[PDB]
């Protein structure tokens, strides 16, 4: 199960990342980077005392996943603005 | 192939639904009911400029959609609030 | 949809690449390399004023795709000879 | 699982067919018709030396094949020309 | 067909590898590493004069596969102890 | 989805079975027959400590299993020996 | 697979429902009338530890269901008594 | 009308047969064993005066049945129990 | 066995019923109503001693009958007239 | 359209006749005997203005019929008795 | 229960009768002629203590019957012959 | 065409057989046995000249017959008695 | 093979006979009356060399038949008229 | 309703047709042809006044008929002869 | 799913084709005869903008087809007129 | 033979019902509404004289039908239109 | 797909097996009795080189099978002779 | 009962027809060709006296068949061969 994602290029020294992230909580998330590389981990909050009579249908899997990536020599980041369940990341090379 | 979604209940009058829909603007999505039934339409803003050269990968198709539902006579909510590709509708019975 | 491909090794300092490329036009193609790495993009010519009565069956998808690859430190190329829809590339390390 | 192929018409006597078949020699492929019908056979040159050690990956199997077709009485073409894993047959009505 | 495998992390400078390898023979295996990187190849012994009346069912594919990996700069190994068809490798960074 | 396994015969009294089961301890697996039938159970040692944080990837689930077989009256083997996720049972007729 | 069904009437001011309900507990199914309709909901006791060896044969499957029923004018419900797998519920007009 | 059945094993001196048997009375069913097997005869109670008006739809046929089962060498029985339309028969070694 | 029956002329708010019933006695016929709606059953009196020689063949079946319909809300009835084996019944809604 | 018949016996000098005969007019039936047999002729009545709406269902058909009878040596006749739209007619043989 | 019949002819002053007639007692059958015909009355025997186990299958039914006959002018009778549980009875016409 | 037949009373180790067979000759019947088990076929003698006028209608089919059953191991037989078209056969196991 | 029959009436001293009777030879049919009835005997013709190819379909069968008749008191006869392969035969009663 | 019919003997190039048709008039029969091929329909003349008493039972259906076949190219016909209700028709191809 | 079909003939030099064609335009289907065969090809008008909300229900599907028909010797085509969904095309021999 | 139908909505004051209705005439169909619903009666034109020879195969049955549909509270109609065998009925709010 | 089957008995000490076996060689099938059961095993000759062009049509599939059969007490086997596709094997009790 | 068949081509002057034909004799089958096609008639040998006791189950129906096949312009035959229930017919150009 691979979550949809987006990636755009802007020129040879700039790239643009867009990530689809509807429904995830802040508490479900913790950061990281290891050896000039890049590590990606997802944890979705363990579900609450929410009555399944109240829960009618669950088509959205809200589970967990984990990715780790060597950053090709040598990419760098700049800021993170999050908006409307889509992820926008500015990248200062 | 079924859409991913989640649904929980809160109290006797209110429900919480989770569907993955990242990046949509309040103009890209619209709420509707008509005397017995109910329709859900996402009408995505005129898309911005899209270059399959810019697009490195398009895993998120973000275009319009349309869902439709019967209203039992005669239930009501309270307001519609939108956030992080997740939708909040207060429903008062 | 992954196009078939071939790869052979010759020894520890030589490798041999064979690519399957039947039907692609010169105008459908443009080159590249970014940051001592390697980028691969496919564009198939937008189809012509070709009458579909004349077109009997289309089993060959002739669409577009795009790949980008960091060259592991540090590979280099030598010439390109193209023959019979198969791709033969000599590689001078 | 159907083979990828394409077919276009040119004029009242001629057609253009596209099938993906890279690397074949005129001896690896042969054209045939016999009084009412028609057979297409690819008979691949005695393969060259193939070492699964050389082979890093074999996505292209390049061995013989056989296709067969009825001829309506009594149609004709003009010549058979082969190029870039694509086949050109001029057909004169 | 991807063989199951396992991987654990211990901290930022240590990793733990576990590989599932039931049924493979010593003679089916030969080692390697190319350009500060890592190459992985599998060869299962060509099957013996073993009578198929005696062979009742073959659900285990015992065939061959091949992987090659650049070691990200710059990982190193320490010893190999093999036990119960699972692979345990100590890794001295 | 069928389990991968292999089965060969040796002599008139003995058979060799190959199933992929890496890492199991003699306490994680148990042999059984009961007057006409036969049961095969893998009962995996109380698992050790498992942290989905430690777990980078879990492709091997190593928990208990249970298989069951009728014994024709009245066949016998000789001993049960376990090695490298492969099982050896000498069977004397 | 469409489920089988029974239902009787007793007179113009009464209806009699007769249902075949083998093996069920009172806690495994519950009645509710919710403004115009009567709903019969089945919820099966938390499974106890049951060894599948202890099960020699299970041809009998035991689950639940939920249906809501408009009371015909003007139906009323009265008691629920269960006997010989048959369940008796008076519905009164 | 013959009953569904289930078998089950319960422990080393016990097995469990489960049969689906709703609405049948103890007196309408009778036990007999004859020479190596076991014969079960059902004589279903005479219907009562039953007004087909009371029957909205009569899908259930209330008649008699008779089953016979070999007692495998050499099972012994303990007690025949019927409840909520499933019939449970324990088998002792 | 259904009686031949007729429904004829009366009014827009009147219906006229005709049933073919030659030879029937009041005592062989008996009336009975059970809420809104209405059901008619015929039981012909125990005759005087009648030899089957007297009744050569029953082509006419003189037994029991049953028929059932829904009333549009809320129709009513006016008189019952019998004539020439034909039944004239005015029904006023 | 000939009339459906039943017949009965009274005695050698007496006979009783039962016939389910809806409709008939004594003035629309006429008697005649001709040379050894007996002939009975039935008519109908002039159709009155009869609206086709008032006839809902004709189960009783009124048309024409034709039959002829003779006396065996040496037969004779008794009385004519009429009853419950059934006729009772004695002859004498 | 009336007896299944076959009949045969001998001659005008003679007749032979075959009837498959299991059971009957000459003393349980009695002759009488009444005014033009002939009447034959059959009885049965007092039921003895008869256990219902000994009767495995009644294919032969013994009940009561009733029949009446007459002589045409001018008929007469011959003899009564009895044979193989078949009766041979001559009259004379 | 099967003979009517009966099986009646004798003992717990005796069976009594009754077949309805009026009019059959010893010569029309013939016995034959072929190992353990046992098969009975009837061929009624070529009659004397018999006109089909003599046999008005065969309602009784006087031809050939065949019936086959398994003996519980190992039953036996005792005498054969014929009476009133009814057959009395004692069978002793 | 007996002939298919139809019959008609003319009058008490006259009768007309229609029978669909293909084949018959006046010389192959012979009349005889015997004691109260009338007997009509039909023959056929000597088979000529008749090739089986010329007979494509026999729908008309020619075999033998046998029938016997008597006069009631007191009957008589009229004429014999022959018509359209249909016979017209008057008697007189 | 198909006429019995026959096809008999004539030649290798001649066919002979026989239809069973006793009682039919030329006026009850009528010929008609519509290109190559050929279709025959029979309409029996309005008879003279004929009472259904005159025709006891129609076992013979004297109505209309229709039959259709393909001619091998290109057969022809020669004469039509009628005899003994049997039809003799020579057909010459 | 095999499509339904109609076809009529008119006489030996004519054929009449009758087809049920609801909702179709003349531009949506086209006739062509192409050397021995007649081909009826259907091509449906470019879809207009149609709101699926504007569609309450579509049980009626509207597409096209293509078939080529050998003219029987010696068929000819004549006009195409459409009415009440029925289409009439004369095919003449 | 009852017609396929489609529904459709057309705008806020309109809905569209589409019914497949080929070959039916306006005069053979009649409209009536009765107390909460709507009743549609089809009386399909009397077939014409139709030669089954003209019918090569007659799969279409030309008979009468009658449909009734509740007008949901409280739809109003505009005009009933039939074309090319589809019937379109617009519904106005 | 369940395979068809034949089997005959010859007498109480004999059984006769008859099987339809078209195209098979003696080497393609083999008999074996293995302690209580008789097993018939089919093994088809090594395929020869067969050109699929040389095959115009193959509606006949040729494989093998293996079944083991309990000899009924007390069956014995005797010879195997094959003729006209039928195979004859005596099984003797 | 008609036979499966296979076709096959064998070389440039040969084709192979393979038909499944078990148990049929040469004399029961006969060849004839008639004007453009080929007709094969099977007349299957008269069954022998066959004891249905010898038949444990008779799934095979031993009757006659007849096949006809057009010899495409213009195939010629060589020899008809039957073996082990498959029928092989070689076709020569």
Author numbering:
A (entry chain F), B (entry chain E), C (entry chain F), D (entry chain E), E (entry chain F), F (entry chain E), ...: 40 to 132
Question: What does the literature reporting this entry say, word for word?
Answer:
Small Heat Shock Proteins (sHSPs) are ATP-independent chaperones which prevent irreversible protein aggregation by binding to misfolded substrate proteins. Most sHSPs exist as large oligomers which undergo drastic rearrangement or dissociation into dimers upon activation during stress, in order to execute their chaperone function. In line with the current understanding of sHSP structure and function, our results show that in vivo, the wild type protein exists in an equilibrium between two oligomeric states: 18-mer and 24-mer.
AgsA:DD formed symmetric 18-mers, an oligomeric assembly not reported previously. AgsA:DD crystallized in the R32 space group with 3 dimers in the asymmetric unit (ASU). The application of the crystallographic 3-fold axis yields a closed 18-mer, with a dimer lying along each side of a trigonal bipyramid. When this structure was used as a search model, an unambiguous MR solution of 3 dimers in the ASU was obtained, with clear and well-defined density for the β-sheets. The outer surface of the oligomer is charged, and its interior is hydrophobic. Though the IXI motifs in the C-termini of the 18-mer could not be defined for any monomer, the positioning of the monomers at inter-dimer interfaces indicates that the C-terminal regions are poised to form the hydrophobic interactions with the neighbouring β4–β8 clefts.
